[PDB]
Design a protein around this ligand. Structure first.
Ligand SMILES: C=C(O[C@H]1[C@H](O)[C@@H](CO)O[C@H](OP(=O)(O)OP(=O)(O)OC[C@H]2O[C@@H](n3ccc(=O)[nH]c3=O)[C@H](O)[C@@H]2O)[C@@H]1NC(C)=O)C(=O)O
Ligand SMILES: O=[P-]([O-])[O-]
Length: 418
């Protein structure tokens, strides 16, 4: 059980290089199961979620190695099941289903269960596949999919907006007979990156990043080389790190058009922001941030993966600000932890109401969330005294070596093995 011991207060300033998007890497690694010649994915972050993906790929029969880049040879894939033991540790494994059924006509993936952040059903994944001609049944907890021959292009109108299901259907359709059209598709940058990787292998896709995606089936996909886009969530997290510590920062290897909503909100909090073509700068000019009001929603609105960080900002800001969550309505476990550190907040239904205090106090807190818990580490950096963040293996799934980057910004942080 690793822990972070953090010493503050400390003013975070300097620069940071952004790693590749964790949530682009993942879908792409699973899309590689479609490829019949070898592919190299560049700029992949070193995260536990990538490790788990590789472990699953390999288990399926693919040939996988890695450093900066990941290498995948999916020619000899010969087992078609993502077993309970893996899926339970990372529900994104469900992404194996699509490609497996599209290419080999069969696929067995464990049905994911409960998550601490809220209800997370996969009905849209299943329904999308059935609509593409797959037959799907559930036995022994496995969703078992099969198709005689290959899938058939279809006009699919999505009941609600879903990143996961949009990816599942998009990927499966690349090897179907004819044209698939996805209506009400998710527009997340990562879905664009995934589509562009697919095209690189010889797929025919258009409309990615808009609500309508068109896929023209081809008979087989090849190999190639593709570089993953920068991680907007990591970028946001560090921008926020500076904004709460009254610091200044430059983020290198960024993609600004990816963060419109976040940057706009940071300006409202009083930050001075400039952007280049692959950098973002933020300066607080020694100022304490002003409270803001936020509502999470699918891209390009403000992202749920940034919600906890902005909650922290508000909790040390001037005034009162609320944050409403419309994507994961129970994603507030960070709030009671920040309360142990002297933050003043209440939760009414799916809105947190924050009353900013001048400074927080060090305490023992517990991580539980892949992305959200990073806010506990950030809190540690600006709190008065010593904070111990327990159970950071969660954070290790989500960020590449966060302590190294924070230290290079002035943080007093240490990883211990209690
Ligand atoms: C928490 C993850 O980030 C999440 C990110 O929060 C969400 C939204 O941004 O989109 C991905 O999740 P996801 O695919 O599960 O999210 P979505 O499917 O868009 O969620 C849609 C919403 O509709 C619901 N939903 C989803 C699928 C479905 O079949 N039915 C359904 O009702 C879910 O409850 C959810 O509340 C990212 N996960 C990955 C691996 O990319 C992470 O960082 O690991
Ligand atoms: O359920 P898994 O995303 O921790």
């Amino acid at each position: 059980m690793d822990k972070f011991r953090v010493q503050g207060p400390t003013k975070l300033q300097g620069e940071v290089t952004i790693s590749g998007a964790k949530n682009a890497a993942l879908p792409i690694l699973f899309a590689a199961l479609l490829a019949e010649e070898p592919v190299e994915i560049q700029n992949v972050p070193k995260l536990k979620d990538v490790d788990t993906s590789m472990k699953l790929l390999s288990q399926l029969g693919a040939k996988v190695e890695r450093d900066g880049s990941v290498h995948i040879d999916a020619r000899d894939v010969n087992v078609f099941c993502a077993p309970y033991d893996l899926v339970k540790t990372m529900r994104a494994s469900i992404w194996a289903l699509g490609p497996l059924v599209a290419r080999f006509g069969q696929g067995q993936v464990s049905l994911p269960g409960g998550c601490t952040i809220g209800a997370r059903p996969v009905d849209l994944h299943i329904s999308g596949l059935e609509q593409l001609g797959a037959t799907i049944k559930l036995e022994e907890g496995y969703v078992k999919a099969s198709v005689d021959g290959r899938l058939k292009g279809a006009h699919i109108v999505m009941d609600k907006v879903s990143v996961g299901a949009t990816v599942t259907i998009m990927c499966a359709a690349t090897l179907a007979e004819g044209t698939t059209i996805i209506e009400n598709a998710a527009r997340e940058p990562e879905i664009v990156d995934t589509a562009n990787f697919l095209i690189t292998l010889g797929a025919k896709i258009s409309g990615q990043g808009t609500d309508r995606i068109v896929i023209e089936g081809v008979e087989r996909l090849g190999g190639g080389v593709y570089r993953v886009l920068p991680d907007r969530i990591e970028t946001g997290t560090f921008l926020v790190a500076a904004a709460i510590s009254r610091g200044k920062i430059i983020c290198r290897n960024a993609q600004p058009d990816t963060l419109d909503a976040v940057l706009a909100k940071l300006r409202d909090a009083g930050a001075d922001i400039e952007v280049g073509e692959d950098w973002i700068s933020l300066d607080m000019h020694g100022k304490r941030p002003k409270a803001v009001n936020v509502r999470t929603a699918p891209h390009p609105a403000f992202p749920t993966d940034m919600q906890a960080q902005f909650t922290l900002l508000n909790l040390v800001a001037e005034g009162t600000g609320f944050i409403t969550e419309t994507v994961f309505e129970n994603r507030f476990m960070h709030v009671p932890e920040l309360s142990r550190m002297g933050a003043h907040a209440e939760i009414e239904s799916n809105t947190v109401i924050c009353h900013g205090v001048e400074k927080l106090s060090g305490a023992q807190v517990m991580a539980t969330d892949l992305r959200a818990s990073a806010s506990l580490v950030l809190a540690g950096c600006i709190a008065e005294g010593t904070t111990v963040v327990d159970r950071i293996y969660h954070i290790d799934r989500g960020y590449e070596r966060i302590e190294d980057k924070l230290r290079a910004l002035g943080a007093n942080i240490e990883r211990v093995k209690g």
